[PDB]
Ligand binder design. Structure first.
Ligand SMILES: [Cl-]
Ligand SMILES: [Zn+2]
Lengths: 30, 21, 30, 21, 30, 21
């Protein structure tokens, strides 16, 4: 897997790909 | 949060999976 | 809506989404 | 232009709508 | 064509578009 | 490689075509 800083919409797509059918949660605020 | 761990710093695939449902 | 600096193809997608059926114009030169 | 207003600086949704047809 | 620095997934999409049916090769290591 | 030529520096369309099959 890529070894880069993943930000914004790029981080979201990475999650989309990685999580598959499980889906995911994106919470930048926390 | 995912931003500090994966954007400000770099995450491994396993690190990214911590944010899957 | 996001409160970030939107550049390049990211700014274009933002417009695509925001403008809907109205379409839009992208003119970086002006 | 949109670049100076939304990329060099930040635009609100209403600001972005100024570039819709 | 755009006169910008193309990096990461943006460089890949640029190649996808430019190369058409020929396809391409992305090798950042070399 | 393509990264040094097109990301670290800027490539023309013809430069980018050097990486097509
Ligand atoms: Cl970017
Ligand atoms: Zn980007």
């Amino acid at each position: 897997f890529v070894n880069q800083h993943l930000c914004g919409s790029h981080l979201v797509e990475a999650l989309y790909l990685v999580c598959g059918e499980r889906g995911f949660f994106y919470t930048p605020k926390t | 949060g995912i931003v500090e761990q994966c954007c400000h710093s770099i995450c491994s695939l396993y690190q990214l999976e911590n944010y899957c449902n």
